Amino acid sequence: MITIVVIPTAHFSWTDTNFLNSVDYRLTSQPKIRDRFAVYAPGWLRRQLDEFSASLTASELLQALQTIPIPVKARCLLLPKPKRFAQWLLDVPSANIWHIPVTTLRATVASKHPSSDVYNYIPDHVPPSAEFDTVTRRVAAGRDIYVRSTKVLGAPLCLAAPAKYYAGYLSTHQLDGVYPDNWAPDNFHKREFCLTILPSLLGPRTFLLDVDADRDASYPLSVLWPQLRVLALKSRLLLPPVALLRRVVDPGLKPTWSADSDAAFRALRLSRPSSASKPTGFDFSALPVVDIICLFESEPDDHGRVAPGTRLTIHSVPTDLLTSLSIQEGVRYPLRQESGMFVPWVLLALLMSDDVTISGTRRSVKLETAHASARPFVHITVERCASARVVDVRGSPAMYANAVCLTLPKGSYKSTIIDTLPAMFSDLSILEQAAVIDSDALGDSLRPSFETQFLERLENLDPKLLDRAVASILSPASDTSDDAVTTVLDVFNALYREVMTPAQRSRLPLLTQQGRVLAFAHSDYELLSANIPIQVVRGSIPIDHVVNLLARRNRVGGTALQVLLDYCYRTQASPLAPTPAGRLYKQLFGPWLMVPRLSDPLIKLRLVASAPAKVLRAAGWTIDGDPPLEVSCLCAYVTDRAMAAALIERRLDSRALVNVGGDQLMFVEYAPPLPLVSIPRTFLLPVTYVVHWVSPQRVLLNGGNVSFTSGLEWTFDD
Amino acid sequence: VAMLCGQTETNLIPSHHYGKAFAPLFASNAMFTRNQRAVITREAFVCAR
């Protein structure tokens, strides 16, 4: 039984049916494979670590935990307070296994201040005047331990006596927390391998799993990662995840004795034949992704030979994207389109990825996708999957079902993901283009466009000053070059503050108070300066945008105004660490990409909010029928009608403030904001949505504008 | 105050206390990392020069 110690990565899925899947889902592909592994990693230990995390240094914690055997056979047996505890040895006389005198017991019953005497001389009694390691040392003995406090570490903690003594001495939730430990044990089995979150002495039969990704920052033991890694490194004990799939373990890639050419290795062949009629007809919060190594090549030489080329690593591209596009390993696909741009699917892979680096080293690169580079790449081949794991998506980058705004530098390929991707399916409702907000919308709203006005003001300056500014921006070494650039910045700032802010502030409901809005902006400042209650995510894409916009020639400005605007926005943007935009894209579109893999049809839902007919008529509306009108705020999808109905009885504590004008422009607002995590993870939401009457034929004439408040209630539909 | 108020437990054996306290420190190879980094430092320095 070789043991592999595991430290979870950045977004390790925890509520998964099997911890094993979040490690690398390829291990579940074959029965012949999954039968070779045990897991352990019990929940009770997890909870203990969650508590002690705030009270021990990494070195101490590692030193304490490292000695614990794999299946913890011991228990911590909490004792009740002496007045309570003493009665137990007489309620059952044979339970007085230490045979404490009856006189002392009833002397304790008589005393106003019952002493620790009942605890005194009891073997392996742990007083509150004890330390964490004291418990751990006894844990290695396997026998149960008697303690006088709940804050203990290393073994499941359960009551020694019936609850009657601890009641009053402890409170409900405290009395509740020990229940699984009161009947804790479960068996551990002797398979070939056993994974574990519990650390251990690294040695000839213990290995550290290396996934090549950042740890879970929230996971309490991530602080141990450096010390563990270096110790493994100095003794060559790291294991790349692929090594686990081989019949015999070895740290290495491309071994002699194995070609590593088997269906098990090919992560692209994601298959789901088995079923259990479980409520998760699908868990749309769990998303399988892969890290892949891809080889890029340019045109061959005059004699058909080709250069060695370069291979890069793409991180955490969702696998269903590739599978649905029938991408296969070992196939040299064409990279460039007719017009020289990238083929769409490659762009999607880049956009939804987290990062792109050179394969060998750990240097991240922003890829160019234009005619800039000489000997440009024309062919691409995916070679192998460095890792393939499922990841939790629920509410990770964005928090509210209402709306979210993503900031990207000018020249990004947002158009591709918002148009080509849904168009590539165009059969299942993904979003409504009327709900997505292009970052350029407000700039286009002014009667002379914001760009035209900026150009018109700008030309008043001397051309040489403008020329000097543009050159300085392009030339990286031109530090500051204050005169030229600052003058332009002043004009930009003055104009934007003057015109853009009031215009932006005049579109408040359009950004947030629709069904569900996805919005783009060139900088967070564009929203903060206008006080728009929408979460803003500072994204970034792993492609060079500057060169990209240098290829777009059909614009108001001759490619020079564009770079000027780009610099201005970047200067305007607040200094902060930006996140990969792919994560947000994964949160939005990811679940939808798994739809075609499903076996059974979907079921629609919604949470319509009522509307009394009185106010409508009072507002001059002509409406048939007495029953209150209702309006669909947001539609959802499930597939197990049973559990879906079972989950529909919850009453959301979020009111809706519906507002609609005479022009039927309808708006919604949730007084308590609706958070995404509140949505059960079996659901599925569209990227964007537009509120609308459930039955437009009920109304016969729109009176004046209307506002009202109502509750929210998930309901079926037909 | 420190130099005028120092005290210890009555029957103290320094060797036992220090030994019991120093045991966890010298428990791993971590105390040798600096040696390796120094070696690389040397080779890098000479080659650069």
Curated annotation (Swiss-Prot), chain A:
Protein role: Minor inner capsid component. Displays NTPase and RNA 5'-triphosphatase (RTPase) activities. May function as a cofactor of polymerase. Associates with microtubules and plays a role in the formation, structural organization and morphology of viral inclusions, where the assembly of cores and the replication of viral RNA occur.
Segment forming the signal sequence: none
Gene Ontology CC annotations of this record: host cell cytoplasm; host cytoskeleton; viral outer capsid
Pfam families cross-referenced by the UniProt entry: Reovirus_Mu2
GO molecular function: structural molecule activity
UniProt protein name: Microtubule-associated protein VP5
Family: Belongs to the reoviridae microtubule-associated protein family.
Keyword terms: Capsid protein, Host cytoplasm, Host cytoskeleton, Outer capsid protein, Virion
Compartment(s) where it occurs, according to its Swiss-Prot or TrEMBL record: Virion; Host cytoplasm, Host cytoskeleton
Organism: Aquareovirus C (isolate Golden shiner/USA/GSRV/1977)
Curated annotation (Swiss-Prot), chain B:
Location in the cell: Virion
Intrachain disulfide bonds: none
Domain of life: Viruses
Similarity comment: family membership: Belongs to the turreted BTV-fold inner capsid family.
Subunit structure, as described in the record: Homodecamer; each decamer is made up of two conformers of VP2, called VP2A and VP2B. 12 homodecamers assemble to form an icosahedral capsid. Interacts with VP6.
Function: Inner capsid protein that self-assembles to form an icosahedral capsid with a T=2 symmetry, which consists of 120 copies of VP2, with channels at each of its five-fold vertices. This capsid constitutes the innermost concentric layer of the viral mature particle.
Protein's name according to its UniProt entry: Inner capsid protein VP3
Species for this entry: Aquareovirus C (isolate Golden shiner/USA/GSRV/1977) (AQRV-C)
Gene coding for it: S3
Shown residues within the full chain: 820 to 868 of 1214
